[PDB]
Amino acid sequence: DLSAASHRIPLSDGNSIPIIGLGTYSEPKSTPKGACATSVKVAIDTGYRHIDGAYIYQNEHEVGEAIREKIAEGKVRREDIFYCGKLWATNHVPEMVRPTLERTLRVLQLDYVDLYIIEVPMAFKPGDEIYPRDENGKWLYHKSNLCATWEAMEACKDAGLVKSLGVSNFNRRQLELILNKPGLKHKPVSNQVECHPYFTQPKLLKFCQQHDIVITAYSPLGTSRNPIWVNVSSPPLLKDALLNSLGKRYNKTAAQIVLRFNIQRGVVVIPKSFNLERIKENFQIFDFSLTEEEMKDIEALNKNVRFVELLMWRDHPEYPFHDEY
Numbered sequence: 600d601l602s603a604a605s606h607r608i609p610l611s612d613g614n615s616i617p618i619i620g621l622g623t624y625s626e627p628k629s630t631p632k633g634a635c636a637t638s639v640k641v642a643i644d645t646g647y648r649h650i651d652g653a654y655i656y657q658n659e660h661e662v663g664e665a666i667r668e669k670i671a672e673g674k675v676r677r678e679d680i681f682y683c684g685k686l687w688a689t690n691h692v693p694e695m696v697r698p699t700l701e702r703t704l705r706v707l708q709l710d711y712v713d714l715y716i717i718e719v720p721m722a723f724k725p726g727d728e729i730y731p732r733d734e735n736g737k738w739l740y741h742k743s744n745l746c747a748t749w750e751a752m753e754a755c756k757d758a759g760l761v762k763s764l765g766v767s768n769f770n771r772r773q774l775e776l777i778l779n780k781p782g783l784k785h786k787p788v789s790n791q792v793e794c795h796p797y798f799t800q801p802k803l804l805k806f807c808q809q810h811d812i813v814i815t816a817y818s819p820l821g822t823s824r825n826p827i828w829v830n831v832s833s834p835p836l837l838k839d840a841l842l843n844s845l846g847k848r849y850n851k852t853a854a855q856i857v858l859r860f861n862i863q864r865g866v867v868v869i870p871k872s873f874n875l876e877r878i879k880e881n882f883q884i885f886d887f888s889l890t891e892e893e894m895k896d897i898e899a900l901n902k903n904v905r906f907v908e909l910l911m912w913r914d915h916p917e918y919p920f921h922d923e924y
């Protein structure tokens with residue numbers, strides 16, 4: 600099926616998405632300047648045709664630098680590259696949506712993005728702070744209105760500034776709010792959520808499939824395990840015994856088995872690496888396949904326990920992870 604040369608899958612709006620992309624979140628204070636640009640360049644040279652980014656990762660200008668350089672030298676055409684950008688919580692006021700996308704286009708120095716998604720379902724205080732809180736450390740929230748935010752997203756598509764619209768960290772209820780919208784013009788085509796053999800999202804995946812929504816697996820290797828966002832008492836995904844033993848069987852690493860697992864089930868994966876060797880390793884997933892028995896055994900690792908619980912926002916009206924899916 601999938602090959603290095605050819606591994607795009609269809610989206611419900613007629614576009615397509617490369618089933619592996621390069622994730623680009625990196626700790627801003629702990630990351631050298633230019634590491635993102637270089638990594639994007641190396642990934643494109645390796646064969647990646649999808650890059651996942653966000654203004655709030657603080658490096659979208661490096662993403663643009665790299666994509667633009669590779670287009671200028673003729674490695675790829677604009678049409679061959681799929682960039683996904685994200686609308687952060689402080690920018691959900693409908694009047695703010697298109698100017699926020701427009702800023703990302705200017706930062707990238709590109710005419711459109713391939714996919715633009717609502718980054719989380721919660722709205723925070725519009726400001727010059729990504730994570731607004733009072734001196735008391737209390738979180739500065741904003742009342743959400745996902746339907747009105749979505750309408751503003753639709754207008755960006757109508758204007759030609761984005762090919763496909765989608766969402767992230769949305770549960771079934773939140774998806775239905777959009778999908779049941781009176782006057783819905785553009786259905787979401789993607790939901791970007793945590794997904795990997797310890798959290799396989801079986802119900803949310805089946806629900807998305809019911810609506811022709813493709814899941815994009817963020818943290819598909821189990822995260823960088825920063826103690827701020829992940830419980831580092833949870834066992835590291837890449838130390839799993841089955842994943843390592845299947846790696847031995849195929850002379851592949853646990854990482855490669857995890858990535859192959861999700862793509863083989865039609866789940867897009869966006870592993871992040873800023874390491875040239877691991878960027879290449881993570882793309883070498885088209886020269887083997889897992890047997891159905893293997894696939895079953897890996898899905899069986901599903902703990903229905905997430906690494907990314909976002910516990911600091913659990914009180915927000917739109918907190919997505921109280922519901923079972």
Ligand SMILES: NC(=O)c1ccc[n+]([C@@H]2O[C@H](COP(=O)([O-])OP(=O)(O)OC[C@H]3O[C@@H](n4cnc5c(N)ncnc54)[C@H](OP(=O)(O)O)[C@@H]3O)[C@@H](O)[C@H]2O)c1
Pocket residue numbers: 621622623624625651652718767768791816817818819820821822823824837852854855869870871872873874877878880881
């Ligand atoms: N929409 C959202 O809410 C959301 C939230 C979180 C993440 N995401 C997106 O999804 C991307 C992926 O997730 P993530 O960055 O959290 O995590 P991840 O991709 O699951 O894991 C990345 C961690 O794994 C290391 N790594 C990469 N390849 C490896 C390999 N072959 N073997 C061993 N270690 C490897 C990386 O270090 P090196 O760089 O040194 O290789 C990094 O520390 C993000 O960068 C972002 O684009 C979206």
Ligand SMILES: C[C@]12CC[C@H]3[C@@H](CCC4=CC(=O)CC[C@@]43C)[C@@H]1CC[C@@H]2O
Pocket residue numbers: 624655818822823824825826828829907
């Ligand atoms: C992107 C983000 C900050 C970075 C977080 C991400 C959740 C997952 C996470 C796992 C880590 O180990 C590193 C930090 C990251 C990558 C958060 C979700 C919303 C917040 O803005």
